[PDB]
Structure 1
Amino acid sequence: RKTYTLTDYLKNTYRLKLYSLRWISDHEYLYKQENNILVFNAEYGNSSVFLENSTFDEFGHSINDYSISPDGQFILLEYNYVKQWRHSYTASYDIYDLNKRQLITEERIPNNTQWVTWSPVGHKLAYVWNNDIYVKIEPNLPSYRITWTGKEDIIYNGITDWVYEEEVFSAYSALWWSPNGTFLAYAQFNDTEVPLIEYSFYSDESLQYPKTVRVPYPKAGAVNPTVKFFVVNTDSLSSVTNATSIQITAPASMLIGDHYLCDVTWATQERISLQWLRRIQNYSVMDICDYDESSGRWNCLVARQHIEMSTTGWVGRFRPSEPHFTLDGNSFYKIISNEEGYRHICYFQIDKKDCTFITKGTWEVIGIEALTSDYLYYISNEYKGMPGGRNLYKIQLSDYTKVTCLSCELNPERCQYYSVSFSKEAKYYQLRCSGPGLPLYTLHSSVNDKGLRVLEDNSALDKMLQNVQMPSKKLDFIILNETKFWYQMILPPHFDKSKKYPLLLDVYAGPCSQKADTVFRLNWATYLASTENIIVASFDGRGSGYQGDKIMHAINRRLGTFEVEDQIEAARQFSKMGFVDNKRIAIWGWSYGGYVTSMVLGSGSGVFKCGIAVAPVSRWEYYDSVYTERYMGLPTPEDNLDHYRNSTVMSRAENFKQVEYLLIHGTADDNVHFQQSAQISKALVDVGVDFQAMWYTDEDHGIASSTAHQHIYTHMSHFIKQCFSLP
């Protein structure tokens, strides 16, 4: 009988099915079946073909994605896709009028467009091209140029520079339509004095001289980009006169120094919320800005700013939390750490002091998902006190005490990890369960929270997997200093506590991470347990998220300490349990996991026989400012420079003589620079330690090209199989 093989992982032999739909009103959504775009009625479940796979067979280009105007009249077609960073890319665009069932060829959207977006209502367009912003009121009409300052690598209007995209907004876009669709707000980033990271890109075999890539990127403590914020009135645009952008300056308490613009939320048609963060990320201000028709200006009264501080750590999980505004725009809710350091929903009324906690407990809210007049819907990990689970709840607005669990009980053995998607105005919602069993997609009505229908049960995949000897998963915890810390273990088929198993510790362990959860996954570890009979453990130690600040801020200004310690201690704990071959314990990790794997390998602990680090950080001065400084402060003598340097992998080289080490990195890694590994290897050479290495030419942090993806996991499997003495 057969197992989950490496070739299965690499080749996607057992495919997970999903069901991504796109809401388009409070009761209809779109969906693709055989590349036909169907539109669905949510209430009754009937559907029909919105767009036929047939159309565009003679288009000329392969179509990459699409977006429909709110008013259903038009559709955007995205082709010539060219990926840049984690979120950004350039592409070409066409517009198809639906009622005319024709393709528009007037005033077309330029090739190399960097970003396009419909207005929330109607058929307006805004797009960035050559770092400048443009606006078409209508798709067959000439665009109005809004900005003139766009300049490659220096001035960005309406799109983000590298660090904002990666660490602040999590997106390339820096444009925000007012709900009216009347205003276009946007940010401008200035990278004039931001230093450049430089690396070689070799390209095709045919490229005689390797090309040098230069990217404005601030490493820890280096000069940051600066930011301006503007708002333009789209209703008032002249063919003759320029477009007048009104600026909104940051609070004076931000203007005194380096800061970031970290969130932008429209409250009403004439109220905006701005979140600002001090470069020292323990202080931030929310600014409420109202339009004044008499002047045309936007004013943010100092009086109604809201303010957040931390004395134990930084602000928010990764940034200040997002405000969810009540419909009238006079109050809002948002996740906040309470007096005991747990993140709960807090209620804020604009011109009033403080805020009011509507939730509390020894658990945390993960996200606020929806807000109607009678209810606030949110995900939390309360159920059964399992930080690694997720369920939908709703709280009765007029009686905070009445909290209903919407998902806890749908299928309590198959489903303990939910996410959700609401329709406009929240009349219907889609539930998505991700484990511990097979992913399961259902539809629901808000009225009586009635289960309308099952959308996808992955029955087909399930029939296949009954054939294979699949691994099982154990989610438990252990006690350390009177504190529970959770772990998981993917266990091989027919597990036997009277046998001894080799064990791989799969590490990430970065701040607010969680590696022990109830998600079902078909991945490299599935192969390792199913086929090679290795146990694959992970452990959430100090610094991990979703358990309260006491645990999360343990690591404050002290990266490469308690999280490293704890992974080691976790392994001592596992050896204690009697079914692990304490001669065959490995450790591996990627990104931040690579850094921790290295530090572990470098600790002299004597627990680990061998390990793999992929694209690991090696010293924090090498990584970016927003991320690094968030946790480490600045690397100056008067701040945290000491620990910046007590915490490098390099300084641990000698101890690598006791272990077998595999070090991997892509040459075109724009995120964690090849530098970081290049310095690790040199430190190891310089001290006479033998080790094994692999570079991947022209790959970035993902090393995700199909061929490279296959090569590295193959390479790594050999490594581990040697180390463990397996066939």
Structure 2
Amino acid sequence: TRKTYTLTDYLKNTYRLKLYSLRWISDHEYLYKQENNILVFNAEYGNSSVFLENSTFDEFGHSINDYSISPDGQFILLEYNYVKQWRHSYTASYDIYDLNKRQLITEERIPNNTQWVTWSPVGHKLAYVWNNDIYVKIEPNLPSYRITWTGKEDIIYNGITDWVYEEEVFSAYSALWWSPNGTFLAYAQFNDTEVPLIEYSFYSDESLQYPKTVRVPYPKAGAVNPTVKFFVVNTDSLSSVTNATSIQITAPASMLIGDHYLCDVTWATQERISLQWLRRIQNYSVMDICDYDESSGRWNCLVARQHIEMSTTGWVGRFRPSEPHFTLDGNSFYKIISNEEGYRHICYFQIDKKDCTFITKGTWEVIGIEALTSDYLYYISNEYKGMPGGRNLYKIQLSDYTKVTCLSCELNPERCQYYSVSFSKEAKYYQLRCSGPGLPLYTLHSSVNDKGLRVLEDNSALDKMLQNVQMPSKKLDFIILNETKFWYQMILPPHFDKSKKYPLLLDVYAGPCSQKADTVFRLNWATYLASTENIIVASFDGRGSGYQGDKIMHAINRRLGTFEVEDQIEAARQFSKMGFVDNKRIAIWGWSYGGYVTSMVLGSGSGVFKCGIAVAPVSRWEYYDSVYTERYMGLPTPEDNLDHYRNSTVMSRAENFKQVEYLLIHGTADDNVHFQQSAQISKALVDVGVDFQAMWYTDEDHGIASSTAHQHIYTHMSHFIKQCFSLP
């Protein structure tokens, strides 16, 4: 008989999905690494040529982590000595290789322990951050110009983000932005001087006699936040005799009145930059549009070009105000904003006009704007078939908004319902990436007549292997709760039989603007649980979930740990009533926000769940970071929202855990959700005499992603679930 998808298959990646990650280098060619050799492809015909031999660096001496070819293709940046920091940050050493003279540059090399590096968008200038300061190199072999001198570890950050800005605002370590042709280099400077530090132990190798104490500026809810300044420097007028002059662009008065954040930076033209600022109370944001003045050499932001964005029901943007997409001349722009019905759609703005015009509408949402030409704007939305968990590419005619054309919907409706896209330089070509419900499919297309040029990768090899495996199926459907439809998905065991009762595991995340019910194909722990253990793994998107309008998303505003937790209990209650579910064997598990919800659910006293697993959960909002927490909860002060901060903790529900089996897991070096959060949960449970299972992972962070720990946690959780379900 055919085998099933086993835990080992998941842990050792027996069945790998093939990808096709290309890098556009112009409007008609892209780079693709094959056999460790970098090839250059012509999009039109599909022909290629070798761009760089894999042997080119046989005696390099170091293991190359990654590479980056300059925009003009004259040089290649080689990254090595990679050392990871937080989610996006890391340091590394770099070397530059001249592709023309086929030589490795040995003079004025980028320093070791460099924190970030980037070529200008055009040409081959380089900007890098080292020791928290910004340096610029006009030529790979020439000495660098020091741009800033205030860089100081854990205090002043120039051109790179501090912990909270990296994690919650920019989702990037870099805080540098080259103007379109590379003339100017804008950058932010963060000051964490008064930000309190989180401290935790790091044990390191067995050989370290005394544990190390890691200390990082981390503002918990309501604590002092870092401050921010924004500068722009002209890199075409740098001197090796005089220090570079950075021009500051100050935030508008409506922002300077109190705490605020810099949340977006987007160049509109060679001499016009837009900046969006957000108040610490995240329901008011301001976009400034500034023009360079050759006369004074300053940047002026006319008030007439200011655009305000606010929310009366919640915060601004999905996680942060959306980015503007400027037209060629920079006189107008398109941006996704919630309309009057609470659905996110594309609005068209005049830079000096207050009112914008919505170009799309309907009870669905635009996920993102992907390309803009003078005749069409391309975007991805979940409009097709009214499925919020599906994604397709559309283009809209800018001269007639009633002319909307779906470009991916009908390519292969049964195999492909969740698309992502990558356009070439001038949107002449685009790569479509289908990630579900069938196996991932990568295709190349031409924009002029939307021709389907060819298939880049169809994963036919994986398809052949999976035919010999008893794979689970996925059901995507919805339930009605108070006239509103909420979607859920179920990973069903092979040969599913509706006349039998299956144990059920509810997989939950449920953070604000999240989506767990979708059409994406995945090979993960749930695949194994369904395929080998015959467990149904369900996920449900309730109030607070995204992509279905603010009525649903903002339902949890100032109220985390309420509706989203109740909705997961309601879903399980519904599921428990279905004929194929064993109501005596229903469990729940989650990681991060999902660990919090799982814990809140288990301590709700609903009596629906037999057991649950919480991995690295938040336990009380006052322990989590300010930017994320305050966005949904406001401030933890008696005059604002302190009462709800105190009523939404896991600890307060400790006694309700007496009737469930609970497994609490957490990495000791978790810099994101501090171990402290689980330490307080266990202490509260010990205090009320409730027994439970626990597991700490020494020196693991929020991902508990090292190879050995990854295998161990899933192995441990599998034994727990099977034991809870009475499975061999």
TM-score of the superposition, structure 1-length normalised?
1.00
* Partner Cα separation in structure 1 for residue 619 and residue 573 of structure 2: 25
* Partner Cα separation in structure 2 for residue 642 and residue 148 of structure 1: 44
For residues 240-272 of structure 1, give each alpha carbon's deviation from its aligned partner in whole angstroms, at most 9, with x where no partner exists: 011000000000100010000000000000000
* Partner Cα separation in structure 2 for residue 523 and residue 48 of structure 1: 37
For residues 131-162 of structure 1, give each alpha carbon's deviation from its aligned partner in whole angstroms, at most 9, with x where no partner exists: 00001100100000000000000000000000
Q: CA offset at residue 303 of structure 1? A: 1.7
* Partner Cα separation in structure 1 for residue 162 and residue 363 of structure 2: 39
For residues 666-713 of structure 1, give each alpha carbon's deviation from its aligned partner in whole angstroms, at most 9, with x where no partner exists: 000000000000000000001100000000000000000000000000
* Partner Cα separation in structure 1 for residue 46 and residue 563 of structure 2: 52
For residues 301-346 of structure 1, give each alpha carbon's deviation from its aligned partner in whole angstroms, at most 9, with x where no partner exists: 1121000111100000000011011011000000000000000000
For residues 356-414 of structure 1, give each alpha carbon's deviation from its aligned partner in whole angstroms, at most 9, with x where no partner exists: 00000010000000001110000000000000000000000110110000000000100
Q: CA offset at residue 470 of structure 1? A: 0.2
Q: 523-532 vs 347-356, which deviates more?
A: 347-356
* Partner Cα separation in structure 1 for residue 207 and residue 327 of structure 2: 58
* Partner Cα separation in structure 2 for residue 408 and residue 15 of structure 1: 26
Q: Which structure 2 residue ranges, 5 or more long, are not aligned? A: none
- Pairwise mapping of residues 395-406 of structure 1 onto structure 2 (< 5 A)? 395-406=396-407
* Partner Cα separation in structure 2 for residue 29 and residue 515 of structure 1: 33
* Partner Cα separation in structure 2 for residue 45 and residue 166 of structure 1: 39
* Partner Cα separation in structure 2 for residue 219 and residue 388 of structure 1: 33
Provide the secondary structure at the position in 2 that maps to 1:425.
coil
For residues 110-131 of structure 1, give each alpha carbon's deviation from its aligned partner in whole angstroms, at most 9, with x where no partner exists: 0000000000111100000000
* Partner Cα separation in structure 1 for residue 517 and residue 175 of structure 2: 34
* Partner Cα separation in structure 2 for residue 586 and residue 157 of structure 1: 47
Partner of 2:329: 328
Aligned pair 1:200/2:186, yes or no?
A: no
Q: CA offset at residue 460 of structure 1? A: 0.2
Q: CA contact under 8 A between 2:364 and 2:547: conserved in structure 1?
A: yes
* Partner Cα separation in structure 2 for residue 369 and residue 28 of structure 1: 18
TM-score of the superposition, structure 2-length normalised?
1.00
Q: CA offset at residue 577 of structure 1? A: 1.1
Q: CA offset at residue 517 of structure 1? A: 0.2
Q: CA contact under 8 A between 2:513 and 2:553: conserved in structure 1?
A: yes
Partner of 2:619: 618
Provide the secondary structure at the position in 1 that maps to 2:41.
strand
For residues 199-251 of structure 1, give each alpha carbon's deviation from its aligned partner in whole angstroms, at most 9, with x where no partner exists: 00000000000000000000000000000000001111111011000000000
* Partner Cα separation in structure 2 for residue 319 and residue 265 of structure 1: 14
* Partner Cα separation in structure 2 for residue 25 and residue 372 of structure 1: 15
Partner of 1:154: 155
Provide the secondary structure at the position in 2 that maps to 1:638.
coil
Q: CA contact under 8 A between 2:489 and 2:538: conserved in structure 1?
A: yes
* Partner Cα separation in structure 2 for residue 352 and residue 2 of structure 1: 64
Q: CA offset at residue 570 of structure 1? A: 0.1
* Partner Cα separation in structure 2 for residue 320 and residue 110 of structure 1: 35
Q: CA offset at residue 518 of structure 1? A: 0.2
* Partner Cα separation in structure 1 for residue 176 and residue 501 of structure 2: 57
Q: CA contact under 8 A between 2:27 and 2:426: conserved in structure 1?
A: yes
* Partner Cα separation in structure 1 for residue 37 and residue 110 of structure 2: 25
Provide the secondary structure at the position in 2 that maps to 1:715.
helix
Aligned residues: 727
* Partner Cα separation in structure 2 for residue 303 and residue 645 of structure 1: 43
* Partner Cα separation in structure 2 for residue 136 and residue 474 of structure 1: 54
Partner of 2:25: 24
Provide the secondary structure at the position in 2 that maps to 1:316.
coil
For residues 60-85 of structure 1, give each alpha carbon's deviation from its aligned partner in whole angstroms, at most 9, with x where no partner exists: 00101111111111010000000000
For residues 588-628 of structure 1, give each alpha carbon's deviation from its aligned partner in whole angstroms, at most 9, with x where no partner exists: 00000000000000000000000000000000000000000
Q: CA offset at residue 417 of structure 1? A: 0.3
For residues 445-477 of structure 1, give each alpha carbon's deviation from its aligned partner in whole angstroms, at most 9, with x where no partner exists: 000000000000000000000000000000000
* Partner Cα separation in structure 2 for residue 129 and residue 374 of structure 1: 43
* Partner Cα separation in structure 2 for residue 32 and residue 236 of structure 1: 37
Q: CA offset at residue 108 of structure 1? A: 0.5
Q: CA contact under 8 A between 2:304 and 2:353: conserved in structure 1?
A: no
* Partner Cα separation in structure 2 for residue 473 and residue 233 of structure 1: 54
* Partner Cα separation in structure 2 for residue 386 and residue 136 of structure 1: 49
- Pairwise mapping of residues 502-517 of structure 1 onto structure 2 (< 5 A)? 502-517=503-518
* Partner Cα separation in structure 1 for residue 131 and residue 395 of structure 2: 45
Aligned residues: percent identity?
Answer: 100
Provide the secondary structure at the position in 2 that maps to 1:55.
helix
* Partner Cα separation in structure 1 for residue 328 and residue 524 of structure 2: 43
Partner of 1:665: 666
Provide the secondary structure at the position in 2 that maps to 1:235.
helix
* Partner Cα separation in structure 1 for residue 181 and residue 368 of structure 2: 26
Q: CA offset at residue 351 of structure 1? A: 1.2
* Partner Cα separation in structure 1 for residue 476 and residue 668 of structure 2: 37
Q: CA contact under 8 A between 2:3 and 2:469: conserved in structure 1?
A: yes
* Partner Cα separation in structure 2 for residue 106 and residue 123 of structure 1: 16
Q: CA offset at residue 48 of structure 1? A: 1.0
* Partner Cα separation in structure 2 for residue 358 and residue 466 of structure 1: 45
Q: CA offset at residue 187 of structure 1? A: 0.2
Partner of 1:563: 564
* Partner Cα separation in structure 2 for residue 70 and residue 592 of structure 1: 40
Q: CA contact under 8 A between 2:591 and 2:617: conserved in structure 1?
A: yes
Q: CA offset at residue 642 of structure 1? A: 0.2
For residues 468-498 of structure 1, give each alpha carbon's deviation from its aligned partner in whole angstroms, at most 9, with x where no partner exists: 0000000000001011000000000000010
* Partner Cα separation in structure 2 for residue 452 and residue 225 of structure 1: 50
* Partner Cα separation in structure 1 for residue 161 and residue 682 of structure 2: 34
Provide the secondary structure at the position in 1 that maps to 2:564.
helix
* Partner Cα separation in structure 2 for residue 325 and residue 350 of structure 1: 9
* Partner Cα separation in structure 2 for residue 496 and residue 435 of structure 1: 24
For residues 515-560 of structure 1, give each alpha carbon's deviation from its aligned partner in whole angstroms, at most 9, with x where no partner exists: 0000000000000000000000000000000000000000000000
* Partner Cα separation in structure 1 for residue 627 and residue 290 of structure 2: 26
Q: CA offset at residue 98 of structure 1? A: 0.8
Provide the secondary structure at the position in 1 that maps to 2:630.
helix
* Partner Cα separation in structure 1 for residue 459 and residue 215 of structure 2: 45
* Partner Cα separation in structure 2 for residue 540 and residue 237 of structure 1: 53
Partner of 2:712: 711
For residues 418-461 of structure 1, give each alpha carbon's deviation from its aligned partner in whole angstroms, at most 9, with x where no partner exists: 00000001000000000000000000000000000000000000
Q: CA contact under 8 A between 2:418 and 2:520: conserved in structure 1?
A: yes
- Pairwise mapping of residues 243-262 of structure 1 onto structure 2 (< 5 A)? 243-262=244-263
Q: CA offset at residue 352 of structure 1? A: 1.6
Q: CA contact under 8 A between 2:437 and 2:520: conserved in structure 1?
A: yes
Q: CA contact under 8 A between 2:88 and 2:173: conserved in structure 1?
A: yes
* Partner Cα separation in structure 1 for residue 657 and residue 703 of structure 2: 26
For residues 176-198 of structure 1, give each alpha carbon's deviation from its aligned partner in whole angstroms, at most 9, with x where no partner exists: 00012000000000000000000
Q: CA offset at residue 47 of structure 1? A: 0.6
Provide the secondary structure at the position in 1 that maps to 2:362.
coil
Partner of 1:49: 50
Q: CA offset at residue 353 of structure 1? A: 2.4
> Please, what is the CA RMSD of the aligned residues?
0.4
Provide the secondary structure at the position in 1 that maps to 2:448.
coil
Provide the secondary structure at the position in 2 that maps to 1:400.
strand
Provide the secondary structure at the position in 2 that maps to 1:92.
strand
Partner of 1:477: 478
* Partner Cα separation in structure 1 for residue 320 and residue 243 of structure 2: 36
Q: CA offset at residue 575 of structure 1? A: 1.2
* Partner Cα separation in structure 1 for residue 576 and residue 279 of structure 2: 45
Partner of 2:131: 130
* Partner Cα separation in structure 2 for residue 628 and residue 99 of structure 1: 51
* Partner Cα separation in structure 1 for residue 178 and residue 315 of structure 2: 30
* Partner Cα separation in structure 1 for residue 328 and residue 87 of structure 2: 33
* Partner Cα separation in structure 2 for residue 501 and residue 523 of structure 1: 19
